Design a protein around this ligand. Structure first.
Ligand SMILES: *[C@@H]1O[C@H](CO)[C@@H](O[C@@H]2O[C@H](CO)[C@@H](O[C@@H]3O[C@H](CO)[C@@H](O)[C@H](O)[C@@H]3O)[C@H](O)[C@H]2NC(C)=O)[C@H](O)[C@H]1NC(C)=O
Ligand SMILES: *[C@@H]1O[C@H](CO)[C@@H](O[C@@H]2O[C@H](CO)[C@@H](O[C@@H]3O[C@H](CO)[C@@H](O)[C@H](O)[C@@H]3O)[C@H](O)[C@H]2NC(C)=O)[C@H](O)[C@H]1NC(C)=O
Ligand SMILES: *[C@@H]1O[C@H](CO)[C@@H](O[C@@H]2O[C@H](CO)[C@@H](O)[C@H](O)[C@H]2NC(C)=O)[C@H](O)[C@H]1NC(C)=O
Ligand SMILES: *[C@@H]1O[C@H](CO)[C@@H](O[C@@H]2O[C@H](CO)[C@@H](O)[C@H](O)[C@H]2NC(C)=O)[C@H](O)[C@H]1NC(C)=O
Ligand SMILES: *[C@@H]1O[C@H](CO)[C@@H](O[C@@H]2O[C@H](CO)[C@@H](O)[C@H](O)[C@H]2NC(C)=O)[C@H](O)[C@H]1NC(C)=O
Ligand SMILES: *[C@@H]1O[C@H](CO)[C@@H](O[C@@H]2O[C@H](CO)[C@@H](O)[C@H](O)[C@H]2NC(C)=O)[C@H](O)[C@H]1NC(C)=O
Ligand SMILES: *[C@@H]1O[C@H](CO)[C@@H](O[C@@H]2O[C@H](CO)[C@@H](O)[C@H](O)[C@H]2NC(C)=O)[C@H](O)[C@H]1NC(C)=O
Ligand SMILES: *[C@@H]1O[C@H](CO)[C@@H](O[C@@H]2O[C@H](CO)[C@@H](O)[C@H](O)[C@H]2NC(C)=O)[C@H](O)[C@H]1NC(C)=O
Ligand SMILES: *[C@@H]1O[C@H](CO)[C@@H](O)[C@H](O)[C@H]1NC(C)=O
Ligand SMILES: *[C@@H]1O[C@H](CO)[C@@H](O)[C@H](O)[C@H]1NC(C)=O
Ligand SMILES: *[C@@H]1O[C@H](CO)[C@@H](O)[C@H](O)[C@H]1NC(C)=O
Ligand SMILES: *[C@@H]1O[C@H](CO)[C@@H](O)[C@H](O)[C@H]1NC(C)=O
Ligand SMILES: *[C@@H]1O[C@H](CO)[C@@H](O)[C@H](O)[C@H]1NC(C)=O
Ligand SMILES: *[C@@H]1O[C@H](CO)[C@@H](O)[C@H](O)[C@H]1NC(C)=O
Ligand SMILES: *[C@@H]1O[C@H](CO)[C@@H](O)[C@H](O)[C@H]1NC(C)=O
Ligand SMILES: *[C@@H]1O[C@H](CO)[C@@H](O)[C@H](O)[C@H]1NC(C)=O
Ligand SMILES: *[C@@H]1O[C@H](CO)[C@@H](O)[C@H](O)[C@H]1NC(C)=O
Ligand SMILES: *[C@@H]1O[C@H](CO)[C@@H](O)[C@H](O)[C@H]1NC(C)=O
Ligand SMILES: *[C@@H]1O[C@H](CO)[C@@H](O)[C@H](O)[C@H]1NC(C)=O
Lengths: 49, 49, 98, 148, 50, 49, 50, 98, 49, 49
């Protein structure tokens, strides 16, 4: 139950374009992609906590 | 009974709701019935008096 | 002192004083030796109180009603979060049964 | 967040519930000698009552108020070749006036010395009471020197 | 947390005065007995282990 | 301060033997009394100390 | 007889301490102190469920 | 419009339901009134053993709801020192507890 | 989140504090015959710091 | 003959108070007569006979 909750949290977009980090860098310039990746970083660190 | 009355009565605490009265509508719902509408069900105490 | 924390305490008028440990006389193992021994001779009855919690009111929550408020369209969106409601409901129900 | 709050509280209650069951089995149903488990003195009996979300225990213990001084001795040495010590280590032999008595070290329970209260050992101590077979009656009133 | 810890911390002046190194004879207990208060205003200090 | 008084009292309590007028006993007697609690001692000269 | 009389007196003070008619003198005994500790723990539990 | 209910499952089957209204819902043919809810089951209430329990409530194999009672045991006693007839255990059996 | 960290740690300390009080009453003041509670062999006396 | 504790080797001279009488004997018991019981219990004097 604990592992399934942590792995499923990887599918969340956290109000970003996509949950895949590579997809963001394939669609935007680094100045704009970094701001959207930060949403995934903060959201995923919350799941680890 | 002293230890159950001298201390503050848990009217605002965990008291199970009369589900049979919460859906009748014959009176405006109290705190216990209001929580039942939000899916919160306080089960009867295992320590039966 | 009527209120205390660590080494500090306050009395009824509010003065702050240093609190001291309670006086207790430790019991001792009587020695097997030729000497003068002190043995308890008179007794008094003392009653002491202890409180231990043995139960907590179990609470179960219906995940569908709490988040969707009974909205039919909302419950269809909730089904995408396959592991969300099942994990919450299982954790609360098992604890109540045990 | 609510599940985290409830699960944490169940851990507190589960630990306290096990202690309460141990106190029911060891302080209420039985009499305990484990010091400090059912009060701070000599446990006699305990009572229990219902309390909000729990149990309340009323431990009944004995606390000493007065003490008695006795001139105790380690043992007896008879004829200088026979050594005797008390059968139980929690017993003490003491002199009261012209006679001798045996008492428990925990509670003052006077007892008349009997030959079954002693255990014979190979050697003697300097601190043992010097006595001969003929005078051992002064310590053990029932003793009779049959062989003499 | 401050209430149940205070209940545990009891004191016995009668037994405390036996904290000499001389009360134990051949048993070296100097590593655990309290240290002599350096300049008053206190009754004891940390031992050689604490 | 309270810790030193707490641990100091407990260490000194081992040297109490229940004597009249609170007189201290030689520590050899304290060990002998605690040995008797395990089994009734018959070694009168206490060579094992 | 002395044990019974002492027990009856203690039980009376316990009920007095649970109500509060002897609050200003409850500090005179450690036995009455245990009642204050028990009441504080019950009060905490009563103020936490909601 | 649709408040939550509770379903009792036993051996992969629904044996009863707790309802807030006096309706024979979920296809059950019998309904009884309990102190704080209605109970619908299909059973006949001619049982005394409960397969599932919670607090003072239990359900039999057929789904009838009954009040569970404390387990009956005989407490041990301290044999008093007095001149009278005393009862002392004479036979013994071996029991294994897990 | 901080309240959760402190309360969880207080659970660990509360359980360990009760065990410490039992070891003070049974191993430090008294002599214990409960096997394994105050070491792995025959207990004589215990010290605390 | 000597009597010792099983927990610690503490030799002791057998005294009549160290024994408990039972109704029957077992084949593994040490067979003596009343006349020779002194060899086991040095303090035993046969008053009768
Ligand atoms: C177990 O608990 C008792 C109860 O508190 C512990 O303290 C002792 O309690 C009695 C009263 O119940 C004290 O008696 C009073 O002492 C002062 C001494 O000057 C005297 O003025 C009073 O008239 C009265 O006799 C007793 O002294 C007190 N012990 C100490 C050291 O103050 C008791 O010590 C506890 N025992 C154990 C083994 O934990
Ligand atoms: C410990 O657990 C055992 C069971 O594992 C308890 O034994 C049960 O004790 C009750 C009360 O004595 C027995 O009930 C009585 O049985 C007789 C014969 O059937 C009947 O005439 C009485 O009216 C009553 O039903 C029960 O049969 C017995 N069960 C077993 C398996 O021995 C025991 O009481 C427990 N002891 C403690 C101290 O908790
Ligand atoms: C135990 O205490 C008694 C008194 O209760 C002591 O008796 C005194 O002993 C001294 C020895 O020099 C005499 O001068 C006194 O006259 C005695 N007093 C009485 C009233 O007889 C005794 O010495 C103590 N014994 C031990 C072994 O400690
Ligand atoms: C057995 O004898 C020894 C001496 O062989 C006793 O020890 C003496 O006891 C007195 C009184 O405390 C001391 O003043 C002596 O200094 C001790 N001598 C030694 C060599 O330690 C011992 O007390 C006796 N033991 C028992 C259990 O009776
Ligand atoms: C019991 O008698 C013995 C002697 O059989 C006494 O022990 C002697 O005491 C004197 C005086 O101090 C010493 O000079 C001897 O060397 C001791 N001999 C032995 C073998 O210990 C003993 O004092 C008497 N006991 C009592 C309690 O008075
Ligand atoms: C008891 O033990 C203490 C602590 O180990 C001993 O004190 C030490 O003694 C050595 C002797 O070589 C010195 O080098 C250390 O500097 C001392 N340390 C301290 C902190 O004082 C002490 O000598 C022992 N005493 C006895 C009687 O055995
Ligand atoms: C214990 O029970 C026995 C019977 O097992 C009692 O003996 C009876 O005592 C009365 C006394 O008036 C006689 O009338 C009966 O004839 C006796 N019965 C038998 C079978 O001898 C005895 O009284 C009881 N004693 C106690 C102290 O409880
Ligand atoms: C003590 O005497 C009894 C006498 O009966 C001995 O037991 C007998 O041993 C013989 C030889 O093995 C058997 O044939 C008898 O049938 C035994 N009788 C009993 C009591 O069953 C016993 O062995 C002797 N024990 C010792 C150690 O002397
Ligand atoms: C405990 O004992 C000390 C003296 O050793 C005394 O000063 C102190 O007041 C006593 N009790 C309390 C409750 O402070
Ligand atoms: C014990 O103390 C009580 C209370 O002071 C007293 O009434 C009683 O007589 C005393 N008993 C003895 C045996 O000294
Ligand atoms: C035997 O009894 C008499 C009294 O008839 C008594 O004088 C004598 O001392 C007793 N014998 C012993 C060894 O005490
Ligand atoms: C003492 O008892 C023995 C028997 O145990 C006997 O033979 C002896 O003669 C008696 N007298 C003496 C002085 O040993
Ligand atoms: C031990 O007791 C003696 C008594 O004279 C005292 O001088 C000494 O300072 C005490 N030891 C400590 C460490 O306080
Ligand atoms: C519930 O309905 C049954 C069947 O119609 C009826 O007999 C009973 O009186 C009703 N009870 C209540 C409390 O409505
Ligand atoms: C319960 O019994 C009724 C009675 O007709 C039956 O029709 C329904 O199928 C049965 N279903 C269950 C749950 O047993
Ligand atoms: C109830 O159960 C008993 C025992 O199985 C059975 O014999 C009886 O027919 C049932 N019905 C009634 C009304 O007692
Ligand atoms: C326990 O005892 C009660 C009262 O004597 C009795 O009615 C009941 O049938 C017994 N058994 C159970 C399981 O409650
Ligand atoms: C004890 O009970 C068993 C059956 O449980 C029986 O076989 C045995 O003979 C009984 N023993 C006595 C001594 O009554
Ligand atoms: C001694 O034994 C004989 C039998 O050998 C018996 O008659 C006598 O009564 C016994 N002595 C006593 C005092 O009973």
């Amino acid at each position: 139950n604990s592992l399934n909750h942590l792995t499923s949290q990887l599918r969340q977009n956290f109000q970003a374009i996509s949950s895949s980090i590579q997809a963001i860098y394939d669609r935007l310039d680094p100045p704009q992609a970094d701001q959207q990746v930060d949403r995934l970083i903060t959201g995923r660190l919350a799941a680890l906590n | 009974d002293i230890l159950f009355s001298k201390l503050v009565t848990s009217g605002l605490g965990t008291v199970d709701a009369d589900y049979k009265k919460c859906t009748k509508g014959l009176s405006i719902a109290d705190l216990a019935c209001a929580q039942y509408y939000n899916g919160i069900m306080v089960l009867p105490g295992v320590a039966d008096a | 002192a009527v209120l205390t924390y660590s080494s500090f305490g306050v009395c009824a008028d509010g003065s702050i004083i240093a609190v001291q440990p309670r006086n207790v006389s430790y019991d001792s193992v009587s020695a097997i030796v030729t000497a003068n021994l002190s043995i308890p001779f008179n007794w008094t009855t003392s009653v002491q109180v202890e409180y231990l919690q043995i139960t907590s009111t179990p609470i179960v929550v219906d995940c569908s009603t709490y988040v969707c408020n009974g909205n039919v369209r909302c419950v269809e969106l909730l089904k995408q979060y396959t592991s969300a409601c099942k994990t919450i409901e299982d954790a609360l129900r098992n604890s109540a049964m045990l | 967040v609510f599940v985290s709050h409830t699960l944490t509280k169940y851990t507190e209650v589960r630990a306290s519930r096990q202690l309460a069951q141990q106190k029911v089995n060891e302080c209420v149903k039985s009499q305990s000698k484990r010091y400090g488990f059912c009060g701070n003195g000599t446990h006699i009996f305990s009572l229990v009552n219902a309390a909000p979300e729990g149990l309340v225990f009323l431990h009944t213990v004995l606390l000493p108020t007065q003490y008695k001084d006795v001139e105790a001795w380690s043992g007896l040495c008879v004829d200088g070749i026979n050594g005797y010590v008390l059968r139980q280590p929690n017993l003490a032999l003491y002199k009261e006036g012209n006679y001798y008595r045996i008492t428990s070290r925990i509670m003052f329970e006077p007892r008349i010395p009997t030959i079954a209260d002693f255990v014979q050992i190979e050697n003697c101590n300097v601190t043992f009471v010097n006595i001969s077979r003929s005078e051992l009656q002064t310590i053990v009133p029932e003793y009779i020197d049959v062989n003499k | 947390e401050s209430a149940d810890v205070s209940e545990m911390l009891t004191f016995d002046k009668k037994a405390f005065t036996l904290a000499n190194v001389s009360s134990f004879g051949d048993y070296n207990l100097s590593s655990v007995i309290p240290s002599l208060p350096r300049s008053g205003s206190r009754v004891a200090g940390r031992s050689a282990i604490e | 301060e309270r810790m030193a008084m707490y641990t100091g009292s407990l260490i000194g309590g081992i040297a109490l033997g229940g004597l009249t007028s609170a007189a201290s006993i030689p520590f050899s007697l304290a060990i002998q009394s605690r040995l008797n609690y395990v089994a009734l001692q018959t070694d009168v000269l206490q060579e094992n100390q | 007889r002395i044990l019974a009389a002492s027990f009856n007196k203690a039980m009376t003070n316990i009920v007095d301490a649970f109500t509060g008619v002897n609050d200003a003198i409850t500090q005179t005994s450690q036995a009455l102190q245990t009642v204050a500790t028990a009441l504080n723990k019950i009060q905490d539990v009563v103020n936490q469920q909601g | 419009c649709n408040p939550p209910d509770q379903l009792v499952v036993y051996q992969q089957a629904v044996v009863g339901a707790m309802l807030s209204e006096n309706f024979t819902s979920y296809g059950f043919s019998n309904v009884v009134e309990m102190p704080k809810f209605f109970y619908a089951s299909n059973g006949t209430y001619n049982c005394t053993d409960a397969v599932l329990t919670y607090s003072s409530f239990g359900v039999c194999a057929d789904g009838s709801i009954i009040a569970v009672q404390p387990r009956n045991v005989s407490y041990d006693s301290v044999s008093a020192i007095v001149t009278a007839n005393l009862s002392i255990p004479f036979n013994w059996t071996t029991s294994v507890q897990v």
